[PDB]
Amino acid sequence: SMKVAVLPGDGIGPEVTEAALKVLRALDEAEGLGLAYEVFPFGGAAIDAFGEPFPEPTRKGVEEAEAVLLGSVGGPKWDGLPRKIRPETGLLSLRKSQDLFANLRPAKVFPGLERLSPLKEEIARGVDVLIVRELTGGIYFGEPRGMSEAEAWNTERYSKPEVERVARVAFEAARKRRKHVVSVDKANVLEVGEFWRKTVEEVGRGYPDVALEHQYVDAMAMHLVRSPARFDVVVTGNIFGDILSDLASVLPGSLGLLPSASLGRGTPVFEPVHGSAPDIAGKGIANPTAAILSAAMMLEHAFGLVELARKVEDAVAKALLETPPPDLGGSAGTEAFTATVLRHLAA
Amino acid sequence: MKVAVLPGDGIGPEVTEAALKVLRALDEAEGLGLAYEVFPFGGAAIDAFGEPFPEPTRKGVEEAEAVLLGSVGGPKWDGLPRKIRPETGLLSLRKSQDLFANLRPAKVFPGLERLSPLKEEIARGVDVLIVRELTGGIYFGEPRGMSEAEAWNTERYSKPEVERVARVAFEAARKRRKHVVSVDKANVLEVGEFWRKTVEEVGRGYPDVALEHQYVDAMAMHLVRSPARFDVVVTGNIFGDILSDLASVLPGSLGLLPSASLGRGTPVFEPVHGSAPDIAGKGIANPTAAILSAAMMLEHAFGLVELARKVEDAVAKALLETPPPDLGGSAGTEAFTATVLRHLAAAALE
Numbered sequence: 001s002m003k004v005a006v007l008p009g010d011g012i013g014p015e016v017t018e019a020a021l022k023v024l025r026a027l028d029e030a031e032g033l034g035l036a037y038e039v040f041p042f043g044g045a046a047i048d049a050f051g052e053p054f055p056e057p058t059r060k061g062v063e064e065a066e067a068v069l070l071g072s073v074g075g076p077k078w079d080g081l082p083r084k085i086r087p088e089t090g091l092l093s094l095r096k097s098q099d100l101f102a103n104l105r106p107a108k109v110f111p112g113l114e115r116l117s118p119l120k121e122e123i124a125r126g127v128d129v130l131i132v133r134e135l136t137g138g139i140y141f142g143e144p145r146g147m148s149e150a151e152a153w154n155t156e157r158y159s160k161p162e163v164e165r166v167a168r169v170a171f172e173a174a175r176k177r178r179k180h181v182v183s184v185d186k187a188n189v190l191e192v193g194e195f196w197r198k199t200v201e202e203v204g205r206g207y208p209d210v211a212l213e214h215q216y217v218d219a220m221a222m223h224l225v226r227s228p229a230r231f232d233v234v235v236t237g238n239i240f241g242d243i244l245s246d247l248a249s250v251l252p253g254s255l256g257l258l259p260s261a262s263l264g265r266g267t268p269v270f271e272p273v274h275g276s277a278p279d280i281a282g283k284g285i286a287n288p289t290a291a292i293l294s295a296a297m298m299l300e301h302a303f304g305l306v307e308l309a310r311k312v313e314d315a316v317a318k319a320l321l322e323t324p325p326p327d328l329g330g331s332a333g334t335e336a337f338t339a340t341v342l343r344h345l346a347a
Numbered sequence: 348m349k350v351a352v353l354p355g356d357g358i359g360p361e362v363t364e365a366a367l368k369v370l371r372a373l374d375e376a377e378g379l380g381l382a383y384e385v386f387p388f389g390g391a392a393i394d395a396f397g398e399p400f401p402e403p404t405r406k407g408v409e410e411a412e413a414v415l416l417g418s419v420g421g422p423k424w425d426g427l428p429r430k431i432r433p434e435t436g437l438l439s440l441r442k443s444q445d446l447f448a449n450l451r452p453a454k455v456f457p458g459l460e461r462l463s464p465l466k467e468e469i470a471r472g473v474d475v476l477i478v479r480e481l482t483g484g485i486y487f488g489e490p491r492g493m494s495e496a497e498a499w500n501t502e503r504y505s506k507p508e509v510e511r512v513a514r515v516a517f518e519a520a521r522k523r524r525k526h527v528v529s530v531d532k533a534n535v536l537e538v539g540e541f542w543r544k545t546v547e548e549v550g551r552g553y554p555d556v557a558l559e560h561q562y563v564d565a566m567a568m569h570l571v572r573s574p575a576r577f578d579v580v581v582t583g584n585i586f587g588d589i590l591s592d593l594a595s596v597l598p599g600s601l602g603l604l605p606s607a608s609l610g611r612g613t614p615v616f617e618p619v620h621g622s623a624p625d626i627a628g629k630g631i632a633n634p635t636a637a638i639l640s641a642a643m644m645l646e647h648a649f650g651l652v653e654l655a656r657k658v659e660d661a662v663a664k665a666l667l668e669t670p671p672p673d674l675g676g677s678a679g680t681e682a683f684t685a686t687v688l689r690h691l692a693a694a695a696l697e
């Protein structure tokens with residue numbers, strides 16, 4: 001029915017993950033999802049227990065599952081250690097072993113939460129944009145690449161199958177939202193841009209259901225500050241995606257609000273944007289919105305349950321208004337806010 | 348003082364004319380020996396000659412001390428073959444003169460915070476100069492090309508290329524707040540890493556100037572959350588295109604953003620906005636970006652810094668007193684130009 005690997009890891013990870021589970025448990029019960037999950041050691045919580053960051057039962061409970069609900073990893077106790085044993089590269093091994101080529105990051109400014117944004121209210125109102133970013137190609141992994149005394153070079157390269165697959169994801173995401181996709185390239189100057197555009201156009205042919213439009217990267221940066229509310233789904237290569245999803249991530253005005261999904265060949269991974277936050281670890285104050293919204297994401301993208309995920313979304317939106325956490329100017333601790341999410345979910 | 352005026356298309360002529368009106372006034376007051384000549388460029392040139400950058404305009408440009416440039420393009424030209432695009436005309440202008448350094452200041456004038464997309468508290472005091480490398484990087488790098496299977500472009504810089512654009516930004520910061528942010532991707536890319544190490548090497552020649560490094564993705568967050576923290580920013584061609592474009596929307600009207608392009612040949616001065624065909628020939632275009640560009644011209648082409656700052660004084664005051672329509676006021680191009688000229692006369696007869 002619903003098989004889930006839970007990797008809470010380090011710091012606030014365990015706390016915010018436990019919060020998501022309450023929500024998932026509340027759902028399973030009232031809706032009958034047949035939720036099956038197990039908990040797996042990960043990051044520094046595993047380096048202490050299995051001399052490794054991403055160990056034997058975890059590697060395999062990952063392959064076995066239909067989805068991975070990740071907390072966050074790293075901390076104070078684990079600083080300045082090898083690329084071998086590093087928590088932050090356990091993340092990279094996890095993400096690679098599943099061949100995850102697409103990163104989906106939504107920035108939503110919730111009703112009533114306009115004041116938080118660094119944009120003026122008028123501009124901030126009604127922003128909900130899903131940036132989809134190609135993740136295993138582009139300039140970051142392109143060749144030729146090198147450096148000498150005299151110069152350095154790097155290659156932004158994309159092949160047809162790399163653009164196609166990421167574009168379908170974005171197209172499939174659009175079918176479940178508002179049926180509008182914007183594709184981002186540098187088509188007026190670069191051969192890769194023009195190749196990107198044309199391929200996404202070819203893929204679009206199979207989705208006349210979805211409105212498709214093309215924006216250049218430099219002008220996309222003007223639009224996300226000037227009128228971000230105009231967008232639904234946005235798809236782009238790796239470096240532009242990095243740049244523009246980071247840009248969009250600031251629009252809501254709190255890091256604790258940001259969920260992430262990573263899709264591909266293997267087992268999908270849902271996780272908060274934020275880190276293990278050892279500065280506020282175990283003070284009972286960590287805002288679980290990001291992990292819960294990661295659980296929502298897990299429902300829509302790994303299991304087909306789109307109406308259910310919108311329920312979790314609507315529950316979370318109402319709670320942020322009613323009992324805002326400290327990072328929002330509010331006063332509600334993790335526990336009390338989760339209970340607020342459940343009151344709304346029980347209605 | 349020998350200028351080549353390249354008015355261009357749409358509002359281009361309109362706003363360039365207002366810039367000239369400010370210049371003739373200055374020439375009268377101060378005795379500049381201003382000499383200028385008007386050349387076809389962009390769509391205008393395509394209609395008369397079939398190419399965006401004719402030999403006659405190439406020669407005018409080569410032979411003057413500065414170019415004052417409006418803007419190019421419009422529906423009549425936009426989707427044309429490449430050899431003859433308004434856009435290609437631009438690249439040809441910049442390459443001919445080898446203008447490697449694109450200087451783009453974004454300023455929220457005292458009292459104009461309400462205009463910004465950003466909350467008043469965050470737009471307050473913003474004044475950031477993006478120094479963008481203009482002749483190199485991924486946009487001109489080889490190998491490049493496309494087949495049915497794949498496509499590739501090459502982000503690459505060499506040492507003397509990073510060095511000279513670096514020098515320009517340190518010299519710029521030295522006449523400002525003495526703070527440079529260099530921007531790379533040193534954490535993932537070889538080119539980032541080389542960019543960074545080379546800027547540090549140039550930084551040692553400017554001990555009075557504080558030098559800091561930021562990744563492009565991070566910069567992009569920082570320019571929205573805390574843009575007022577920055578003085579000078581220096582970066583490559585694509586990151587510069589992106590970040591300076593981002594910064595250009597912070598003031599809240601593209602009517603307000605001037606720019607300079609400086610290199611080996613004749614420097615080019617131009618508003619950041621396009622040809623605004625929605626409003627062209629309606630007499631409402633804001634001439635600020637053009638007037639400020641002519642002020643950049645006076646400092647960087649002619650060493651008339653105190654004049655350039657006076658011009659910026661008269662503009663800032665006029666913005667407040669009689670705002671143009673893009674600021675919520677009613678002041679047409681000419682009416683606004685007059686207000687500027689009156690504050691210029693008034694501040695000078697003191």
Ligand SMILES: NC(=O)c1ccc[n+]([C@@H]2O[C@H](COP(=O)([O-])OP(=O)(O)OC[C@H]3O[C@@H](n4cnc5c(N)ncnc54)[C@H](O)[C@@H]3O)[C@@H](O)[C@H]2O)c1
Pocket residue numbers: 012072073074075076088255256272273274275276277278279280285286287288290327
């Ligand atoms: N995606 C990731 O897993 C990730 C990302 C960045 C950093 N890290 C790692 O985590 C550790 C901390 O680095 P960091 O502090 O820059 O990342 P961080 O997200 O933990 O810290 C960001 C800041 O925002 C606050 N914050 C973060 N999440 C919050 C939440 N859910 N509710 C309320 N406040 C919240 C933190 O207290 C901190 O001041 C480091 O070891 C770093 O390497 C991990």
Ligand SMILES: NC(=O)c1ccc[n+]([C@@H]2O[C@H](COP(=O)([O-])OP(=O)(O)OC[C@H]3O[C@@H](n4cnc5c(N)ncnc54)[C@H](O)[C@@H]3O)[C@@H](O)[C@H]2O)c1
Pocket residue numbers: 358362417418419420421422425601602603618619620621622623624625626631632633634636673
């Ligand atoms: N430097 C350049 O030459 C340059 C830059 C950008 C676009 N373009 C070209 O110009 C056209 C672009 O039209 P566009 O709408 O995308 O960009 P645009 O900058 O011309 O217009 C953007 C918006 O700002 C308004 N606006 C711009 N300048 C103004 C001013 N000085 N005063 C008052 N309002 C102003 C316009 O009316 C429009 O609504 C195309 O042909 C494009 O190729 C040229």
Ligand SMILES: [Mn+2]
Pocket residue numbers: 242243246564565
């Ligand atoms: Mn990033």
Ligand SMILES: [Mn+2]
Pocket residue numbers: 218219588589592
């Ligand atoms: Mn641009």
